[PDB]
RNA sequence: ACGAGAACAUGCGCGACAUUCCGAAGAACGCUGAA
């Protein structure tokens, strides 16, 4: 996991749903009911409602708590847990990581299997992949999605990502050497056909200047989300033409209006450490 | 002082045997909008 990886759980929580300490630089992920009943008991529920009515757009919970000056230990009692944060801008949005019924951090094996199937294509019953081992929640830190299209820009999409598996095959259908060779070939194709376009852009120059890409980057996979359209899907020029056509067909606003073929289709992460990072990249190891 | 009188359509018996709700699925893509 050389880059922050977020596997969504279908739940997106707003700024007002959780607390964000800017000075302490930590995000308190809180459940709803505990906070609601705490405010009902302490008389802060009507105050919270008036706060929501006063400022519709920005309703950060931490600023409201500071305005009411509530005790920090009274904050901890309704907080589900806390996470270390990284922002390039209070946070706007937040995407939660996938948690099973018990609540441990884990990457589902289905994500790995789907990524492997996509990269290998170019059936699939023999390759049986199971869930990865549980990970302690402290590795779950909140990162930001940043778009680099000739210029870097922070985005409101903040995502809970992991900080930077048992599998069985049948010998005839799949082989470890063949699948790893195909993974490496797919990564090389991704580098040659699309990564060079981002290298040439000035935003890419800024990214490499700060050492954003790992020096080492073998077997590299795009496990989680935020990786891009070059993944999750040919001659180079024909491929670019197909992506441009499909983007024009689907996204009427950004791509449909503009007729000219961009420099690279598609046109497009900050951490408290000076090194820049990219979302979704992972390094894998297979043992028999 | 009835082609009549008596006379169980009854005895035994498993709706059973064989059967993977399963195979295929990355929670992900565009990155921007307003002032």
Swiss-Prot record:
The keyword Ion transport does not apply. InterPro entries: CRISPR-assoc_Csm5, RAMP_III_fam. It holds the Pfam family RAMPs. One of its GO terms (biological process) is defense response to virus. One of its GO terms (molecular function) is RNA binding. The keyword Cell inner membrane does not apply. Keywords: Antiviral defense, RNA-binding. CRISPR (clustered regularly interspaced short palindromic repeat) is an adaptive immune system that provides protection against mobile genetic elements (viruses, transposable elements and conjugative plasmids). CRISPR clusters contain spacers, sequences complementary to antecedent mobile elements, and target invading nucleic acids. CRISPR clusters are transcribed and processed into CRISPR RNA (crRNA). Part of the Csm effector complex that includes Cas10, Csm2, Csm3, Csm4 and Csm5. PANTHER family: CRISPR SYSTEM CMS PROTEIN CSM5 (PTHR38007:SF1). Encoded in a type III-A CRISPR locus. NCBIfam families: cas_TM1807_csm5. Belongs to the CRISPR-associated Csm5 family. This is CRISPR system Cms protein Csm5. It comes from Enterococcus italicus (strain DSM 15952 / CCUG 50447 / LMG 22039 / TP 1.5). The lineage of its organism: Bacteria, Bacillati, Bacillota, Bacilli, Lactobacillales.
């Amino acid at each position: 996991v050389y880059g922050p990886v977020h596997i969504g759980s279908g739940k997106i929580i707003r700024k007002q749903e959780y607390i964000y300490d800017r000075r302490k630089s930590l995000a308190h992920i809180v459940d709803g009911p505990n906070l609601v009943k705490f405010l009902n008991k302490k008389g802060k529920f009507t105050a919270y409602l008036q706060y929501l009515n006063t400022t519709k757009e920005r309703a950060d919970l931490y600023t409201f708590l500071r305005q009411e000056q509530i005790d920090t230990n009274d904050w901890k009692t309704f907080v589900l847990y806390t996470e270390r944060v990284n922002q390039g801008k209070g946070m706007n949005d937040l995407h939660l990581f996938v948690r099973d019924g018990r609540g441990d951090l884990y990457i589902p094996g289905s994500s790995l299997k789907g990524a492997l199937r996509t990269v290998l294509e170019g059936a699939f019953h023999s390759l049986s992949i199971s869930d990865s081992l549980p990970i302690d929640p402290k590795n779950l830190a909140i990162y930001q999605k940043i778009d680099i299209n000739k210029e870097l820009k922070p985005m409101p999409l903040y995502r809970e990502c992991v900080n930077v598996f048992t599998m069985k095959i049948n010998s005839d259908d799949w082989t470890i050497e063949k699948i790893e060779k195909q993974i490496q070939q797919a990564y090389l194709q991704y580098w040659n056909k699309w990564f060079v376009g981002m290298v040439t852009t000035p935003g890419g120059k800024a990214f490499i200047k700060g050492g954003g890409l790992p020096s080492v980057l073998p077997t590299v996979l795009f496990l989680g989300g935020g990786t891009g359209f070059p993944s999750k899907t040919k001659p180079k020029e024909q491929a670019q033409k197909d992506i441009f056509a499909i983007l024009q067909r689907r996204f009427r606003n950004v791509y449909g209006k503009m007729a000219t073929v961009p420099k690279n289709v598609p046109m497009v992460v900050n951490d408290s450490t000076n090194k820049w990072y990219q979302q979704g990249v992972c390094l894998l190891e297979f043992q028999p």
